[PDB]
Ligand SMILES: CCCCCCCC/C=C/CCCCCCCC(=O)O[C@@H](COC(=O)CCCCCCCCCCCCCCC)COP(=O)([O-])OCC[N+](C)(C)C
Ligand SMILES: CCCCCCCC/C=C\CCCCCCCC(=O)O[C@@H](COC(=O)CCCCCCCCCCCCCCC)COP(=O)([O-])OCC[N+](C)(C)C
Ligand SMILES: CCCCCCCC/C=C\CCCCCCCC(=O)O[C@@H](COC(=O)CCCCCCCCCCCCCCC)COP(=O)([O-])OCC[N+](C)(C)C
């Protein structure tokens with residue numbers, strides 16, 4: 189229970205880290 | 221919630237947030253998911269993805285509930301994520317339906333004890349009698365094929 | 373994976389790659405699947421198909437997993453492929469759900485061994501006998517083609533599969549993995565009064581009890597006539613079913629199906645994790661192949 | 668329901684499992700040593716098999 | 719097995735050969751000859767069925 193709650197909570201912060209930093213509209217066609 | 225263990229209800233929901241975060245990262249890392257949403261007029265640097273974090277949970281929950289969503293990934297690295305999370309989904313719903321079709325037929329096959337013969341086989345339910353009474357004296361004296369087993 | 377035979381799990385996956393290749397060929401052979409993806413402006417020779425080989429597996433897997441895809445064919449030759457592969461899909465999922473709803477409601481369990489011959493090949497399940505007893509003396513003396521092989525085991529692993537008494541042999545089957553060999557009238561006494569044990573196999577030797585008399589006694593013939601009189605009236609079946617009756621164990625306790633934990637399913641979580649690790653290797657594989665085209 | 672009635676059924680395994688069947692009928696050699704046993708028997712099932 | 723019968727070498731009433739055959743049968747039964755004989759004639763054609 190604990191390791192898998194640790195791995196997902198790592199990936200949950202990284203997904204917010206990609207969502208905020210990526211402009212994702214028309215910028216960086218091949219990046220991240 | 222009975223046909224699946226509470227270990228399993230947590231492990232589905234932890235994998236529902238898990239694969240949703242992986243499919244979001246693996247779509248940004250892939251170049252094939254970047255294209256133009258404007259195919260009518262030609263390119264004017266309008267290369268754009270579709271996977272938000274909000275959409276990736278909507279693909280995670282939307283495929284778990286057997287309904288589907290509007291994303292439908294188109295890179296080979298993202299379709300393998302969708303190809304496994306779909307096979308993860310069938311063997312949960314078809315295990316939830318099959319186990320709930322086992323709980324409802326076991327408590328329909330069961331009958332309460334209705335006689336001494338139905339009580340002649342039970343060991344969870346134990347007998348009883350007044351000691352040195354007219355009731356106990358009958359089973360000590362009896363010979364008919366079941367009451368001896370009830371006296372045993 | 374139990375509710376479908378391993379013949380069937382291969383025949384589904386062979387048909388999943390099979391119909392995917394047919395639907396790809398039969399869409400290119402058909403003229404009706406060729407049209408324009410640009411309906412806003414008029415034609416400028418922009419007639420274009422939609423079925424790649426990558427899309428045809430995505431229609432094959434995407435329809436097999438009851439989710440659907442974005443292709444949705446529009447020629448009559450391709451819709452008959454989609455119309456049959458859909459009917460192929462329902463009678464797999466509704467046969468997988470119905471058979472898994474038959475395993476979880478009726479447990480029909482079987483022991484690995486059924487005879488001495490089925491125990492003559494097992495090395496995980498080890499034998500046992502009372503040392504210097506009448507049971508061990510038989511296999512030392514025996515010559516019949518299997519019991520010598522059963523003695524080839526026990527003579528090698530002495531003080532390992534040779535027990536000291538009957539009480540230790542019962543307490544070793546009950547705790548460890550063990551296949552203890554003893555008399556047949558004690559097994560019919562232990563099994564009736566210990567409901568979690570069983571008797572596998574049949575009678576190997578054929579002994580017999582008997583009222584002993586002195587050498588040249590007059591009572592031998594009068595008891596022999598007396599035993600045969602009791603044996604035909606049914607008293608020696610009334611006596612044996614009075615003392616070897618035991619406590620009268622249960623043989624029906626189909627419980628509620630004891631909800632699916634990590635022990636029942638959970639190999640699904642293995643193939644879930646194996647799919648995501650494989651997807652990363654394809655991602656870094658296609659991250660470089662696109663740049664190799666750009667280089 | 669078809670696949671679990673196939674699993675709930677058991678084949679006959681004894682005289683007691685044959686003591687309840689009426690679709691499957693018994694048999695014995697008439698005036699033989701086998702029929703003479705069930706005529707003479709008294710043990711609780713074989714009388715029903717002789718009935 | 720429902721009943722429990724048994725065969726036997728018949729002798730006249732008060733024959734000397736009863737005790738000498740009884741010792742002889744028990745000698746053959748422990749050496750394994752009466753399992754070699756029964757698996758020679760009740761062996762049959764050796765059926766395949768298992769499946
Ligand atoms: C892209 C790739 C496609 C591949 C085709 C599909 C794959 C073909 C199938 C292959 C395997 C089945 C046949 C092999 C049998 C060998 C037995 C074995 O060792 O199994 C082992 C596990 O097995 C696994 O771990 C399987 C993991 C593979 C993940 C597949 C993901 C790809 C699907 C992509 C989806 C496509 C998406 C759409 C694409 C457009 C046994 O485990 P164990 O630890 O030994 O436990 C036993 C312990 N005990 C002995 C004590 C009891
Ligand atoms: C954004 C938000 C995401 C949320 C997800 C969270 C997932 C879930 C995680 C954890 C679930 C929480 C466990 C419950 C523990 C409380 C126990 C309890 O007291 O029972 C309470 C039950 O009432 C509820 O708790 C219902 C709440 C449903 C979950 C919230 C909706 C999910 C939305 C998903 C939307 C997808 C988003 C799609 C995105 C594109 C009240 O009980 P009672 O009647 O007061 O007491 C009577 C007691 N008696 C009956 C025994 C007699
Ligand atoms: C109902 C849903 C609809 C149907 C969906 C069908 C799809 C394919 C489904 C299954 C095809 C795989 C072949 C299975 C053959 C049986 C192997 C076996 O017995 O156990 C193996 C399990 O170990 C594994 O191999 C794990 C594989 C699980 C399925 C992974 C398929 C990838 C997802 C598919 C996505 C793309 C599809 C493919 C197209 C590219 C061996 O392990 P074991 O422990 O040593 O076994 C001994 C235990 N026993 C004695 C009891 C047996």
Ligand SMILES: CCCCCCCC/C=C\CCCCCCCC(=O)O[C@@H](COC(=O)CCCCCCCCCCCCCCC)COP(=O)([O-])OCC[N+](C)(C)C
Nearest residue numbers: 192195231234235238239634638641642645646648649650
């Ligand atoms: C990018 C993804 C990386 C991972 C992030 C996950 C993303 C989120 C998805 C899912 C997260 C939440 C669910 C957890 C998933 C499975 C873990 C689990 O609980 O199963 C078992 C624990 O497993 C063990 O840790 C011990 C046994 C290891 C088996 C093989 C490990 C391979 C894992 C993958 C490595 C690569 C595989 C090969 C690659 C080609 C539970 O079993 P148990 O209760 O202990 O009792 C049985 C014990 N027995 C198993 C011995 C019989």
Ligand SMILES: CCCCCCCC/C=C\CCCCCCCC(=O)O[C@@H](COC(=O)CCCCCCCCCCCCCCC)COP(=O)([O-])OCC[N+](C)(C)C
Nearest residue numbers: 252296389424425426429650653654656657658659661665
């Ligand atoms: C170590 C062992 C582990 C395994 C090793 C691998 C692990 C990783 C190690 C190394 C990475 C290797 C990964 C493979 C290549 C991926 C990259 C890619 O697909 O891009 C291209 C490669 O083009 C091709 O060469 C053809 C292969 C893709 C089409 C076939 C898909 C159907 C697969 C069925 C699945 C089941 C198969 C049957 C299963 C029984 C394809 O390009 P495109 O997007 O299609 O077209 C657009 C291109 N254009 C823009 C220029 C026009």
Ligand SMILES: *[C@@H]1O[C@H](CO)[C@@H](O[C@@H]2O[C@H](CO)[C@@H](O[C@@H]3O[C@H](CO)[C@@H](O)[C@H](O[C@@H]4O[C@H](CO)[C@@H](O)[C@H](O)[C@@H]4O)[C@@H]3O)[C@H](O)[C@H]2NC(C)=O)[C@H](O)[C@H]1NC(C)=O
Nearest residue numbers: 481483496497540543544545546547548549550567568569
């Ligand atoms: C379901 O079926 C399983 C198949 O046999 C069975 O598994 C065995 O269970 C027994 C106990 O029930 C296990 O015995 C254990 O062995 C370990 C070895 O390290 C011991 O720590 C311990 O034995 C002890 O022995 C003492 C005497 O030396 C005794 O006094 C103690 O009380 C204690 O029993 C454990 O008992 C055995 O290993 C299992 N076999 C395996 C894993 O192969 C399950 O019990 C059975 N479950 C049910 C509910 O019936």
Ligand SMILES: *[C@@H]1O[C@H](CO)[C@@H](O[C@@H]2O[C@H](CO)[C@@H](O)[C@H](O)[C@H]2NC(C)=O)[C@H](O)[C@H]1NC(C)=O
Nearest residue numbers: 545546547563564565566567568569619621622
């Ligand atoms: C047969 O053996 C099993 C396994 O030992 C017994 O089942 C359980 O055994 C554990 C021992 O670890 C007890 O704590 C449980 O209470 C037992 N479950 C029950 C009683 O439901 C089982 O009882 C044994 N059968 C007998 C003794 O008749």
